[PDB]
Design a protein around this motif. Structure first.
Motif, PDB file in Angstrom:
ATOM      1  N   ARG A   9     -77.043   9.235  32.964  1.00 10.71           N
ATOM      2  CA  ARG A   9     -75.916   8.936  32.085  1.00 10.71           C
ATOM      3  C   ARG A   9     -74.839  10.017  32.009  1.00 10.71           C
ATOM      4  N   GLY A  10     -75.092  11.203  32.531  1.00 10.88           N
ATOM      5  CA  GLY A  10     -74.150  12.306  32.384  1.00 10.88           C
ATOM      6  C   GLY A  10     -74.293  12.946  31.005  1.00 10.88           C
ATOM      7  N   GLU A  11     -75.449  12.787  30.371  1.00 13.43           N
ATOM      8  CA  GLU A  11     -75.669  13.429  29.079  1.00 13.43           C
ATOM      9  C   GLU A  11     -75.558  14.964  29.229  1.00 13.43           C
ATOM     10  N   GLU A  12     -74.857  15.612  28.322  1.00 17.86           N
ATOM     11  CA  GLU A  12     -74.789  17.057  28.388  1.00 17.86           C
ATOM     12  C   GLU A  12     -75.847  17.681  27.481  1.00 17.86           C
ATOM     13  N   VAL A  13     -77.061  17.799  28.036  1.00 14.50           N
ATOM     14  CA  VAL A  13     -78.235  18.179  27.291  1.00 14.50           C
ATOM     15  C   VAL A  13     -78.293  19.668  26.966  1.00 14.50           C
ATOM     16  N   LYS A  14     -78.696  19.965  25.742  1.00 19.61           N
ATOM     17  CA  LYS A  14     -79.032  21.318  25.369  1.00 19.61           C
ATOM     18  C   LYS A  14     -80.405  21.262  24.733  1.00 19.61           C
ATOM     19  N   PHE A  15     -81.269  22.133  25.217  1.00 20.20           N
ATOM     20  CA  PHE A  15     -82.647  22.116  24.806  1.00 20.20           C
ATOM     21  C   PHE A  15     -82.809  23.221  23.734  1.00 20.20           C
ATOM     22  N   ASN A  16     -83.136  22.769  22.542  1.00 11.54           N
ATOM     23  CA  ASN A  16     -83.495  23.642  21.461  1.00 11.54           C
ATOM     24  C   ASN A  16     -85.021  23.891  21.535  1.00 11.54           C
ATOM     25  N   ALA A  17     -85.380  25.068  22.002  1.00 14.13           N
ATOM     26  CA  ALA A  17     -86.750  25.464  22.199  1.00 14.13           C
ATOM     27  C   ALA A  17     -87.304  26.234  20.998  1.00 14.13           C
ATOM     28  N   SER A  18     -86.713  26.056  19.822  1.00 12.57           N
ATOM     29  CA  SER A  18     -87.141  26.788  18.627  1.00 12.57           C
ATOM     30  C   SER A  18     -88.556  26.368  18.116  1.00 12.57           C
ATOM     31  N   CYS A  19     -88.938  25.123  18.364  1.00 17.58           N
ATOM     32  CA  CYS A  19     -90.098  24.568  17.712  1.00 17.58           C
ATOM     33  C   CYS A  19     -91.042  23.920  18.726  1.00 17.58           C
ATOM     34  N   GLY A  20     -92.274  23.686  18.310  1.00 17.86           N
ATOM     35  CA  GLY A  20     -93.214  22.879  19.083  1.00 17.86           C
ATOM     36  C   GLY A  20     -94.399  23.694  19.549  1.00 17.86           C
ATOM     37  N   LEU A  21     -95.535  23.037  19.657  1.00 21.64           N
ATOM     38  CA  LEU A  21     -96.732  23.683  20.273  1.00 21.64           C
ATOM     39  C   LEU A  21     -96.421  24.226  21.686  1.00 21.64           C
ATOM     40  N   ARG A  22     -97.009  25.364  22.043  1.00 23.36           N
ATOM     41  CA  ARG A  22     -96.549  26.004  23.280  1.00 23.36           C
ATOM     42  C   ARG A  22     -96.792  25.186  24.536  1.00 23.36           C
ATOM     43  N   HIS A  23     -97.863  24.386  24.590  1.00 24.97           N
ATOM     44  CA  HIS A  23     -98.107  23.550  25.744  1.00 24.97           C
ATOM     45  C   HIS A  23     -97.011  22.519  25.953  1.00 24.97           C
ATOM     46  N   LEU A  36     -93.997  22.774  24.570  1.00 25.03           N
ATOM     47  CA  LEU A  36     -92.734  23.554  24.708  1.00 25.03           C
ATOM     48  C   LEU A  36     -92.477  23.965  26.125  1.00 25.03           C
ATOM     49  N   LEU A  37     -93.499  24.537  26.770  1.00 22.10           N
ATOM     50  CA  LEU A  37     -93.363  25.029  28.115  1.00 22.10           C
ATOM     51  C   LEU A  37     -93.316  23.911  29.163  1.00 22.10           C
ATOM     52  N   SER A  38     -93.876  22.745  28.861  1.00 20.77           N
ATOM     53  CA  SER A  38     -93.740  21.604  29.759  1.00 20.77           C
ATOM     54  C   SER A  38     -92.286  21.130  29.733  1.00 20.77           C
ATOM     55  N   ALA A  39     -91.728  20.930  28.531  1.00 24.51           N
ATOM     56  CA  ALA A  39     -90.326  20.570  28.382  1.00 24.51           C
ATOM     57  C   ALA A  39     -89.407  21.619  28.990  1.00 24.51           C
ATOM     58  N   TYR A  40     -89.696  22.908  28.762  1.00 24.87           N
ATOM     59  CA  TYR A  40     -88.889  23.988  29.375  1.00 24.87           C
ATOM     60  C   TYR A  40     -88.771  23.852  30.920  1.00 24.87           C
ATOM     61  N   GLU A  41     -89.914  23.593  31.573  1.00 24.57           N
ATOM     62  CA  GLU A  41     -89.928  23.482  33.054  1.00 24.57           C
ATOM     63  C   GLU A  41     -88.999  22.337  33.485  1.00 24.57           C
ATOM     64  N   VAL A  42     -89.156  21.184  32.844  1.00 30.39           N
ATOM     65  CA  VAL A  42     -88.375  20.014  33.201  1.00 30.39           C
ATOM     66  C   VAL A  42     -86.873  20.287  32.982  1.00 30.39           C
ATOM     67  N   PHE A  43     -86.525  20.727  31.784  1.00 30.08           N
ATOM     68  CA  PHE A  43     -85.098  20.893  31.456  1.00 30.08           C
ATOM     69  C   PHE A  43     -84.435  22.031  32.259  1.00 30.08           C
ATOM     70  N   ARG A  44     -85.172  23.108  32.472  1.00 27.84           N
ATOM     71  CA  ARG A  44     -84.662  24.185  33.282  1.00 27.84           C
ATOM     72  C   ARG A  44     -84.333  23.718  34.738  1.00 27.84           C
ATOM     73  N   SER A  45     -85.127  22.811  35.291  1.00 28.88           N
ATOM     74  CA  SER A  45     -84.842  22.331  36.649  1.00 28.88           C
ATOM     75  C   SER A  45     -83.558  21.510  36.757  1.00 28.88           C
ATOM     76  N   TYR A  46     -83.144  20.904  35.654  1.00 27.99           N
ATOM     77  CA  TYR A  46     -81.879  20.204  35.534  1.00 27.99           C
ATOM     78  C   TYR A  46     -80.710  21.138  35.200  1.00 27.99           C
ATOM     79  N   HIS A  47     -80.958  22.436  35.063  1.00 25.60           N
ATOM     80  CA  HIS A  47     -79.869  23.363  34.729  1.00 25.60           C
ATOM     81  C   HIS A  47     -79.229  23.106  33.362  1.00 25.60           C
ATOM     82  N   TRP A  48     -79.990  22.530  32.437  1.00 23.33           N
ATOM     83  CA  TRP A  48     -79.461  22.290  31.129  1.00 23.33           C
ATOM     84  C   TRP A  48     -79.695  23.546  30.324  1.00 23.33           C
TER      85      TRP A  48
END
Ligand SMILES: [Mg+2]
Length: 380
Positions: A85-99, A101-113
């Protein structure tokens, strides 16, 4: 603008997923919370606060197990739809269990968000990616009401010549607290007699009429024009004057002092007097009262005022700490302001529990000690 969105991972203390969206500088007015099915209720609460501000919300459910290749798979599906969709995503990594958190981090980081974290102590929003972005201090916008909603509770909330008289009366009593000790106890008993009888007048015994400190107090009430005292009869002008003499003077003074400090400390972003707090458990309910509640640097600060002494298996401090946790989560802070001396037990106990204290000796510096406590919240 319309394509700008946040993604955040729900946890049991998700305040830092909301405060970035309340900051006037944040462009995004939409967030997708990622959570498991049992966190639907946290989602609904988060949404009550954000939706109020016309910030929109969605809930994307990951599976609840600890399998992280299944979490990464669910999130990559989400990411790919957002990317398409061309969403301009920003990932707020402030919260969440670390497992999660770090799964979401890997995914979003690969998209350069871009990815950021609000450090809970400083309240700085910190850009993890790209490190070139500039960290900023999150603005202080969330209210007490919002705070309670987030944590599963609900609060019910609440002159000029009267207010100043009540304020100055409180200053006098606070600053001569040890001198006035016994007298305020007798005044409390007299106010309580009026309360129980549903009247505003009470005749003093002849013994009460000879009490030195009581008379200092009666004549303050008289000068302040909030009672008359004639022929051993004390009459309050109204219920608020009766409550004041009953002991509400100290919380009124503390509230009034917080309001003064706030004139020069914009980190104190909200304040209230005698908040009624309700939590439903099935058909059942637990009710609490917050004598003075504030939010400062986006952290809930609760102040309990006592005008009587602590018993003796006393629950005051265990209960205060427990409210703090349950109503504002990990960053919440609490103080006990006590008109009467504090036994060393309770001092050591307040320290053990991380509760701040202001006792009679320091009541003459109430405004400074309160300022210090609020400065320690950071955010400046
Ligand atoms: Mg963890």
């Amino acid at each position: 603008n319309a394509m700008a969105i946040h993604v955040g991972i729900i946890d049991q203390d998700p305040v830092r997923l909301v405060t970035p969206l309340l900051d006037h500088r944040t462009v995004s007015r939409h967030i997708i919370f990622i959570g498991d099915h049992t966190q639907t209720v946290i989602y609904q609460r988060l949404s009550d606060v954000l939706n109020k501000r016309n910030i929109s919300t969605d809930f994307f459910e990951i599976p609840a197990g600890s399998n992280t290749s299944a979490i990464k798979s669910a999130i990559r599906e989400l990411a790919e739809t957002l990317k398409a969709r061309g969403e301009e995503v920003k990932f707020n990594a402030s919260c969440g269990l670390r497992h999660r958190l770090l799964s979401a981090y890997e995914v979003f980081r690969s998209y350069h968000w871009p990815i950021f974290v609000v450090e809970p102590n400083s309240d700085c929003l910190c850009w993890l990616y790209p490190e070139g972005n500039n960290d900023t201090q999150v603005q202080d916008r969330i209210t007490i009401a919002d705070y309670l909603t987030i944590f599963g509770a609900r609060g019910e909330f609440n002159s000029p010549q009267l207010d100043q008289q009540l304020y100055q009366l409180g200053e006098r009593w606070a600053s001569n607290a040890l001198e006035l000790g016994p007298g305020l106890a007798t005044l409390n008993y007299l106010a309580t007699t009026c309360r129980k009888e549903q009247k505003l007048d009470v005749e003093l015994s002849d013994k009460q009429q000879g009490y030195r400190e009581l008379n200092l107090l009666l004549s303050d009430l008289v000068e302040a024009k909030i009672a008359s005292y004639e022929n051993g009869i004390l009459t309050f002008i109204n219920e608020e004057a009766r409550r004041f003499a009953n002991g509400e003077w100290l919380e009124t003074l503390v509230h009034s002092t917080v309001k003064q400090i706030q004139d020069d400390m914009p980190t104190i972003q909200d304040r209230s007097l005698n908040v009624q707090v309700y939590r439903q458990l099935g058909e059942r309910e637990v009710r609490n009262e917050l004598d003075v509640a504030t939010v400062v640097n986006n952290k809930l600060h609760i102040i309990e005022c006592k005008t009587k002494g602590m018993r003796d298996g006393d629950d005051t401090l265990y209960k205060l700490e427990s409210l703090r946790d349950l109503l504002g989560g990990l960053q919440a802070r609490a103080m006990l302001v006590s008109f009467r001396p504090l036994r060393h037990n309770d001092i050591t106990r307040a320290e053990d529990l991380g509760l701040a204290l202001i006792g009679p000796d320091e009541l003459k510096d109430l405004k400074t000690h309160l300022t210090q406590w609020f400065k320690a919240a950071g955010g400046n």
